[PDB]
Amino acid sequence: AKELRCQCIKTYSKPFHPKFIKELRVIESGPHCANTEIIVKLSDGRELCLDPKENWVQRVVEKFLKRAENS
Amino acid sequence: AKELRCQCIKTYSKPFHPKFIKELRVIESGPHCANTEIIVKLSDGRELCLDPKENWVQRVVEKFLKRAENS
Amino acid sequence: MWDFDDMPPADEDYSP
């Protein structure tokens, strides 16, 4: 209990397509973060952190849910 | 490329409250699953699988999003 | 890298 950083080091404040997303991850304020952070698996291989502060994020993410649900 | 099982083989048949949920995980149909599965993680450090086929799942999960977003 | 289309990050410090 000394110093803990949020899961998302930074957020990718740049629009891109939902086509690349296969897995979604949402972590609510934890013992390391006093807020909320959206995370996503990047089909390139890595992971990526999105900022719910952007409208395009609420959209590409919304489509993922509507797509994984309709599937 | 021989045999791959879905990330979630079983589900939880006991409705609960997002109060125990701290991290959400959603995996769309992958090379191992031809459908959609909503995984979740409890603060206790545990991981279970929910069935979007249940109405109470769409609710306790919906609250988590509305809670992590309002935070 | 070829996963993209002419596009995800051309930078990477987003490793939770």
From Swiss-Prot, chains A, B:
Resulting phenotype, R67A: Impairs heparin-binding activity and leukocyte transendothelial migration
Disulfide bridge map: C6-C33, C8-C49
Protein name stated in the entry: IL-8(7-77)
Record organism: Homo sapiens (Human)
Complete-protein stretch covered: 29 to 99 of 99
Swiss-Prot record, chain C:
Compartment(s) where it occurs, according to its Swiss-Prot or TrEMBL record: Cell membrane
Coiled-coil blocks: none
UniProt superkingdom: Eukaryota
Family stated for the protein in its record: Belongs to the G-protein coupled receptor 1 family.
Summary of the function given for this chain in its UniProt record: Receptor to interleukin-8, which is a powerful neutrophils chemotactic factor. Binding of IL-8 to the receptor causes activation of neutrophils. This response is mediated via a G-protein that activates a phosphatidylinositol-calcium second messenger system.
Oligomer and partners: Interacts with IL8. Interacts with GNAI2.
Protein name: C-X-C chemokine receptor type 1
Source organism per UniProt: Homo sapiens
Full-protein residues shown: 9 to 29 of 350
